[PDB]
Design a binder for this molecule. Structure first.
Ligand code: ZN
Lengths: 129, 153, 148, 341
RNA sequence: UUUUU
């Protein structure tokens, strides 16, 4: 059964880039997916993506530029304190300033350094680098 | 016309041919004996080497290959498979030690750094056309000394 | 004319009295994987290992190997181009990195060699007074550098 | 004698003289040489064959070491420059070289190079005569200038080697270590002169050493310095003083050219199509296929061996796959391409 | 050893 739509989406992105595809289709959609892709877009790893509604959960079609070295989810969504963030960044990233750990914090979905600047914490969604 | 019948026979024969490799290929799949596969490879490697099917490696290609081996170190005993055999006395046996040794040498192969073919169309058109008998045979004489396919035959 | 190379003035039997902090270290191509693979940052795994400021150095030959690797090792390529990593020019035709590294340490006894290749490590081991850095387990390890 | 002519194509399987046989008889020479000239028309290779053919017809103008030091090899080194694996080209080297010698200086050149003069004068006269019969029967005053010829091209050299093959198809020998490595162990210390070879069509003896034949002392191959070629052509076999059979080598031949030449003879057979990665029976039609085969060259009571695999064209004549044409590796690699397209 | 169109 479908347990994590976000994991399936990110796996689709990884397969798409690995095969060199410029565009990839993701189904089903979810607000977390759009927020995650918006963070990725802001960091520039991903280009334009467009939502297609069908009167069901919907679909995404995302343009790809080959700047994504890896992207993945962290399941289960461990609670993360501010002290614990650097531990996660050390584990999941080849270097701290290469990549971002995306946290769903009380102020929204956002990358780790933004969370440090805002002094907020929460659960961990995944990583991109 | 009748040419379609010739066409049908043509596809029929091809469909026969594809099944045959399918039966043969399908049966060869089930045989997964290490000895049988081992012999088949060695015959195959000889044929490739004798026929020179594999293109020679340019010096650049060797450098790329040597680049990967150094840059990874995939062919040493620190690999998962090799380390497991070493630490549990599996390499005392000769066959597994050979499977280890072939791996190591494969890695070592990558680590290595007066003035004095156009095949002859010797068919009859290639000949020099020289130009020069029965009465001589008359002298030679002076020496002295499908049916039945469908009807009764 | 016969040649008997003069042993370096930086050496007293087997201790190099010249290598001192901040250390200059030459980076081998294979080092980058076992750094990336172990999630060990290059600059600071060195500081944690040596407890000093370390100046990594990438030569043209080791660099020349890296782009030849291709897309699979892009991350290694990018980390090699981190501006904190200085570059060393080379004036020898060959691109074989192992020979180039062995020559440079032969020339001047001021470099640490960061590598995990057994063959290269043995060659450096024969040369006296060359601290040899490697990555194992979780972090970097230095063998012939007693100031530690 | 009958079997030899059949190999040369002079006689058919019914022992009836072929058209080639009729043409061959027009020449004053042995059938081996006549076949050589029969195929020589390509690429102006005719003068070179005529030079060689006359030389081998008359015998060696060379004086050997036993009958006789620095000067000797100096002359030998000059004439072995064309090829380091052919004694035939040395004869071509000497014979052609003499055409550039001014008439007054032939004798001095002759003594300086340890050459048997009377054989050469007869060689020169026959090259004229064979140059006469060719021109008269193909279309005739022949001058000494007409005998003058320039150095062969590298292509001509390879082509010319295949000319010698056609007249000596049955006199090919292989290095014994190839067929029977257990019996013929060649070391880096083994002398070239003692490297065994096995003639084609040689009688199978219970002991295989009896079929070994070794290089004659007079061959340049003894001074070659590297391993002798895979296959070799010989003129004749002589019993050495050590009860060791010695062959008078002609020249080397590569396997695939050998197969092409033996294709028209009775000396070549074809294995079943090979299978595996790379080698695949490409099927154009139910009566067409391109596939790799192993040519088995030589006629189980004799010694023949298998050649390197070759890409070939097959067409089903009356149910038996017959070889139409040989195919290069690139030709085969393309062919599998279009079907996938 | 001979020797041939
Ligand atoms: Zn260099």
């Amino acid at each position: 059964t479908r347990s994590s739509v976000l994991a399936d989406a990110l796996n689709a992105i990884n397969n798409a880039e690995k095969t060199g595809k410029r565009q990839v289709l993701i189904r089903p959609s979810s607000k977390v997916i759009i927020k995650f892709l918006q963070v990725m877009q802001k960091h520039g790893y991903i280009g334009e993506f467009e939502y297609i509604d069908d009167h069901r959960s919907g679909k995404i079609v995302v343009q790809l530029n080959g700047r994504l070295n890896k992207c993945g989810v962290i399941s289960p969504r461990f609670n993360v304190k501010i002290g614990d963030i650097e531990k996660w960044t050390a584990n999941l990233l080849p270097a701290r300033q290469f990549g971002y750990v995306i946290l769903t914090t009380s102020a929204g979905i956002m990358d780790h350094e933004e969370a440090r600047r805002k002094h907020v914490s929460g659960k961990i969604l995944g990583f991109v680098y | 016309p009748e040419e379609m019948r010739k066409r049908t026979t043509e596809m029929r024969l091809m469909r026969e041919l594809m099944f045959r490799e399918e039966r043969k290929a399908r049966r060869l799949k089930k045989i997964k004996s290490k000895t049988y596969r081992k012999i088949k490879k060695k015959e195959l490697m000889k044929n490739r080497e004798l026929a020179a099917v594999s293109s020679d490696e340019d010096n650049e290609d060797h450098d790329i290959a040597r680049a990967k081996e150094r840059m990874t170190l995939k062919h040493k005993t620190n690999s998962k498979w090799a380390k497991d055999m070493i630490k549990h006395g599996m390499t005392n046996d000769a066959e597994t030690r050979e499977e280890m040794e072939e791996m190591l040498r494969q890695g070592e192969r990558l680590k290595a750094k007066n003035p004095w073919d156009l095949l002859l169309t010797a068919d009859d058109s290639t000949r020099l056309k020289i130009v020069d008998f029965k009465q001589q045979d008359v002298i030679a004489e002076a020496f002295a000394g499908l049916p039945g396919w469908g009807e009764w035959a | 004319t016969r040649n008997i190379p003069q042993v370096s003035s930086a050496l007293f039997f087997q201790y190099n009295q010249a290598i001192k902090p901040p250390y200059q270290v030459l980076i081998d191509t294979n080092f980058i994987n076992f750094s990336i693979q172990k999630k060990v940052d290059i600059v600071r795994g060195m500081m944690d290992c040596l407890l000093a400021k370390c100046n990594p150095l990438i030569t043209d030959c080791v660099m020349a190997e890296l782009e030849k690797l291709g897309p699979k090792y892009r991350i290694a390529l990018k980390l090699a181009r981190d501006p904190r990593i200085k570059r060393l020019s080379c004036s020898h035709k060959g691109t074989y990195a192992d020979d180039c590294l062995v020559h440079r340490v032969l020339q001047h006894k001021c470099y640490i060699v960061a590598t995990n290749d057994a063959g290269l490590k043995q060659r450096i081991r024969k040369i006296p007074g060359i601290p040899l850095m490697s990555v194992g387990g979780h972090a970097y390890v230095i063998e012939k550098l007693p100031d530690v | 004698a009958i079997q030899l002519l059949q190999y040369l194509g002079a006689l058919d399987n019914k022992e009836m003289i072929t058209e080639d046989g009729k043409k061959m008889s027009l020449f004053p020479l042995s059938p081996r040489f006549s076949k050589m000239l029969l195929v020589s028309d390509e690429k102006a290779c005719l003068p070179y064959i005529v030079a060689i053919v006359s030389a081998l017809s008359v015998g060696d103008p060379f004086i050997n070491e036993f009958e006789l030091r620095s000067k000797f090899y100096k002359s030998r080194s000059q004439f072995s420059k064309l090829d380091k694996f052919s004694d035939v080209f040395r004869l071509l080297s000497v014979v052609s070289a003499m055409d550039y010698v001014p008439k007054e200086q032939k004798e001095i050149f002759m003594k300086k190079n340890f050459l048997r003069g009377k054989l050469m004068e007869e060689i020169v006269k026959l090259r004229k005569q064979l140059m006469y019969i060719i021109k008269s029967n193909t279309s005739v005053v022949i001058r000494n200038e007409d005998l003058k010829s320039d150095i062969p091209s590298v292509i001509q050299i390879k082509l010319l080697k295949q000319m010698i093959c056609a007249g000596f198809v049955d006199h090919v020998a292989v290095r014994a270590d190839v067929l029977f490595p257990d019996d013929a162990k060649i070391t880096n210390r083994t002398s070239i002169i003692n490297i065994p070879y096995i003639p084609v069509l040689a009688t199978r003896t219970p002991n295989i050493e009896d079929c070994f034949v070794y290089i004659h002392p007079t061959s340049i191959l003894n001074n070659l310095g590297e391993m002798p070629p895979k296959y070799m052509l010989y003129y004749s076999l002589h019993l050495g003083g050590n009860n060791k059979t010695r062959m008078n080598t002609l020249c080397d031949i590569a396997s695939t050219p050998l197969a092409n030449i033996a294709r028209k003879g009775l000396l070549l057979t074809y294995s079943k199509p090979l299978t595996g990665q790379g080698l695949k029976t490409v099927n154009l039609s139910p009566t067409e296929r391109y596939c790799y085969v192993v040519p088995r060259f030589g006629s189980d009571l004799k010694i023949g061996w298998d050649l390197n695999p070759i890409a070939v064209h097959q067409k089903k004549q009356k149910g038996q796959w017959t070889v139409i044409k040989f195919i290069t590796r690139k030709g085969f690699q393309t062919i599998t391409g279009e079907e996938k397209e």
